[PDB]
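Complex record, eleven chains
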Amino acid sequence: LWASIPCPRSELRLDLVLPSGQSFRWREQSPAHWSGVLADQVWTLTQTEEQLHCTVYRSQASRPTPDELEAVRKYFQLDVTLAQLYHHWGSVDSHFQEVAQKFQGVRLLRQDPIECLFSFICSSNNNIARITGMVERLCQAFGPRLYHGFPSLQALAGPEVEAHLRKLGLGYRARYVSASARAILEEQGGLAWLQQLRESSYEEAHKALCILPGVGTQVADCICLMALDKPQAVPVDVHMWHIAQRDYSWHPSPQTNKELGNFFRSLWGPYAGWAQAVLFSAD
Amino acid sequence: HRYRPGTVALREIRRYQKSTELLIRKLPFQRLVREIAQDFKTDLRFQSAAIGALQEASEAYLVGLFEDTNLCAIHAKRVTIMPKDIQLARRIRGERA
Amino acid sequence: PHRYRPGTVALREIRRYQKSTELLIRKLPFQRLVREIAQDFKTDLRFQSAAIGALQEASEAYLVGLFEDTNLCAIHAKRVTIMPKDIQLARRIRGER
Amino acid sequence: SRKESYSVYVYKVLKQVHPDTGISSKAMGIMNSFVNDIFERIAGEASRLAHYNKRSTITSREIQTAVRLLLPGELAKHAVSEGTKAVTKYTSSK
Amino acid sequence: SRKESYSVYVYKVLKQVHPDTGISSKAMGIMNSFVNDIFERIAGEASRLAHYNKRSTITSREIQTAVRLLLPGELAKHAVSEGTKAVTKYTSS
Amino acid sequence: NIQGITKPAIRRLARRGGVKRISGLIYEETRGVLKVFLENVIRDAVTYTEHAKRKTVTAMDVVYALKRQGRTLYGFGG
Amino acid sequence: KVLRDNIQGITKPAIRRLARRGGVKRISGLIYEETRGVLKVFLENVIRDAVTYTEHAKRKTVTAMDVVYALKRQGRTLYGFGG
Amino acid sequence: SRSSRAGLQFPVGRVHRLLRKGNYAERVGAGAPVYLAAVLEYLTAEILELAGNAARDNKKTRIIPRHLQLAIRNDEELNKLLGRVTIAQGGVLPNIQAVLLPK
Amino acid sequence: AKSRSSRAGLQFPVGRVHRLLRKGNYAERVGAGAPVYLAAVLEYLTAEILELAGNAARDNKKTRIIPRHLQLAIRNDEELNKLLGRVTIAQGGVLPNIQAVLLPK
DNA sequence: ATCGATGTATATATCTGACACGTGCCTGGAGACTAGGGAGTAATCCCCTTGGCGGTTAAAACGCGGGGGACAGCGCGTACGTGCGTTTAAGCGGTGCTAGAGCTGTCTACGACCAATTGAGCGGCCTCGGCACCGGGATTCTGA
DNA sequence: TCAGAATCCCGGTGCCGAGGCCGCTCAATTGGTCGTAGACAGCTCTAGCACCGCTTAAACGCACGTACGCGCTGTCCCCCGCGTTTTAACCGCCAAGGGGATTACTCCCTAGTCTCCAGGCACGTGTCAGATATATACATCGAT
């Protein structure tokens, strides 16, 4: 039932950020009260002005515990003062000036790297609604019923049962998922490897991520931007590229995407990634 | 990079053989048809469908003629077509004496 | 004892056979050929002499025209000798099979 | 005014051969023109045959020989077979 | 039985043009077949014109248009002039 | 307006025919050929219109002119 | 009476004469077989129609008019033999 | 009706009327329209079958002049029957001379 | 004069042409002027061809027209050759023509 | 150049059979009359062809580098041409038989034409479901 | 290697053939009633087929040489690819009125029919244009 935790609305728009295509386990169950699973339990997310709201299940449900609260808030990364950055972005970028004077409160969140990787693998040339449905199907089909959770690294593959995933609507992405799931096990160090990429430089993490099947430049950029803590990363999604065309352009191919990302990083500085999200959720 | 000469020609051939739209611009061809027509009879009127049929027939005729002149050029062991090829093709097809 | 260089007698023969107008294929072989062909369509037919004459005349005219077109192709390819590829080109361009 | 065309019968044949498939108006026009062209060819050839043979009438026989003249080998044989079938069936119920 | 051809008239014109010249039998046959072929062409074109225009009668205008369509270049002009002259003379009496 | 048949249009027509490389004078040659063909068809079409006493060249007239040329066309009438 | 192999009756010098009437000065060695094949195809095409015309009239003799009509319908009008 | 009796789908009556008004001959036997309608129906069925197969190859459910052109030119028989006719919006059969291909 | 050919001033058989037009089954009705026009056209074409053929025969020193002379007259003229471009004339022969490249050096 | 061999066009003479001319006659063309409907002519309608304007933006036009294809020389070896002697069989002229092409007589089964009847099919909206294409938090695959 | 294409599926457009009723033409049927086209049975005699011998022109086989078709190399120039500037094609929309199609009416031209008769066809004849044969004077090609 009702819970509250101090953080100003300007720091985060919990009402809007969640369906913005970063994590696909979030969808409405109660009005203005988003529901989704993380840390193998279900949470409800809304916000008030002087505090946020975050409540959990226990029938003896009254309030959440400090450890769960801090885990979810860390997921939100709320320990960074996001609001002030408009002071640096409005004056460093002319278009982000108009974005800042329009609306406020968009940031990035930290889900598990495995969830980020697989969700964005399912996101190749797809719409957010379909990726949401596809993830809900894949989790139900394979991962445990915790709303169904992500499966294990090994349990995501099997004895050539990879045709099963195609029955979920996964399409051509099933081959990607199967090959990448087998590779992360048979030629990489699993969770410690993924953490290593969380503690590896930007270009090294980029190169390491791009080497696996099913993930390209843009998916790797998204994994670096969220769940691997690389705020300088500026993913080039179709919305980003179109906004670039309608805002400012000079010159798509891998070289062009590299140059575009380099220029965007040069413009929005070290925290470019977080700025991109504000621009992204504008459409 | 820079595509080597002749490679874009192949993709152009594939592109224009797979599709079926018209290749000649409509208005210039219509104007040409009227300019030729006024010689035989002044102040003629043309149904839109009539000019469409004329354009379709002319394009089909020219495409066939180029297919034949290309065969001629290849027969001469050349790859580039030249006016002598068109003259040979028309002469053989009986369009010239 | 004399010998003309190559092509001189061929030119004399060309002049002879373009100045005269008689038939060029022997009659009985062509009659036997038409009867042999006819066997495949209906049995024990009987042919009017005029029918075989007309067949032979048309056949020779068609072959002469075909050879003119073949010569045109051979010259176009910078050659003087006619070759099977020339005949195939002439046939293909004419629309024949 | 009232314009006669084969767009009804051609469609009837289509659903008899390819039940799922449909046909666009542009192709229906192509089919109608094609049917008219072949009808004109066969009728003209039959007329010339009747004129050559001093006959005043064109009957099933003239149409049969005209079909054999115009169509290529396999097509002619199948068309003749179908025409004979149709004529025999029709005359079976006078 | 009785056969008929244009051999009399083809010779009539010949004598009118070249009085001293003669014509061999095979040449006369070729001329007769030429006349038949031209007549067939013009008649067929006139019939098709009448059918196109929904009209049922072959008039002089149909022949004139068929000639204009079939004959190339100066032949069309001269033949049309000759036909018009003949028709006018015929109608004058 | 024969000079209105643009060079790239002739190139596209040649491409549809399977041509790979085109000489400079092919453009003028093609323009001449097209002019001759159009003149031949249009003369017969105009003759048909004059015969019917009309002054609007109808699609059927073009179709008949092409058919008489031994270049039958489908899709416009019959 | 059965017949066979008469296609070779169209001799090499006959092909040479036909070519010379066409203005060909120099001839290859392989031209003859191709010419014989072409002639055989053309004769088959004409005689098929001629035999069809003869069959239609219930005749058993292929008359000159049948050949002339077969040629005429093939777009190869012939003069001097009939019609 | 005569179409029903002959088992055909095409109109025998219309074919008879056209053979009459068309002025092809002074008289028209009873068997001619039936035979002619049967032949026309057969040819239409054949070409429509080929066109439908071509359309299915292209993952389309409608026959459009492109499919008619493909069916006509890919079939060795129809091609001979309809060699001289041009089909509006027909295009041409994909064909590039082997000599022109890259080494 | 009785005959229609005399009235029209023609040499060709107007009456026979009228019969052929009617019996040939070209149309339901035949106009009165169509036979005259057609006969005049045929006569003009025949006169043209025979004029050219007689010219050719005189060029050859002969007095009788033979298929060779008809062939020469038809092929040499530039508009008749387009009218009869796909017509074979028995015993016709060909026009003397040797390509330039083949001539001796 | 120069001269010789072979070929071609030109002269002159004989004989013949193919074409020009004459005669008979019959059947198809011409003359005369009726009629009825096909074609000419006048009015009306509305639709669809010409004409114009503004913008946007796709295609055309122009310039330049240079890569490779066209074109010219040269060499060679074998495929073709020319010519001679030898062998085949096509062309010519006769003799003989008969299949069937062409024509005549007929009479009946068919088709033309008419009157009375109705439903097959055409044109007009209407309502679709349905088809075709695009686009989406790109990546992989493929060839230059 | 860095450009272009293809992959799965859901949702959103947007057009668009396919029934569907409805009304109604008109022409396709059904049933009769006649006239003649031609299917059939004969009969005639043309011409197509078969074979037979003879002559000699034509085709075959082979030898020898050279010229030309093929391959290779080198030059060089001119089309292709690409980028940038320019222009007019295309799309939409609105207006005017020219003429193409309809309808009605009217009459004069063609079809049908019945008498005659003379123009063209079949047959027969004569003679001269030309095919054949002998004579040779000039032309062109190849050797020198």
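Note: Chains G and A do not touch (no CB pair under 8 Å).
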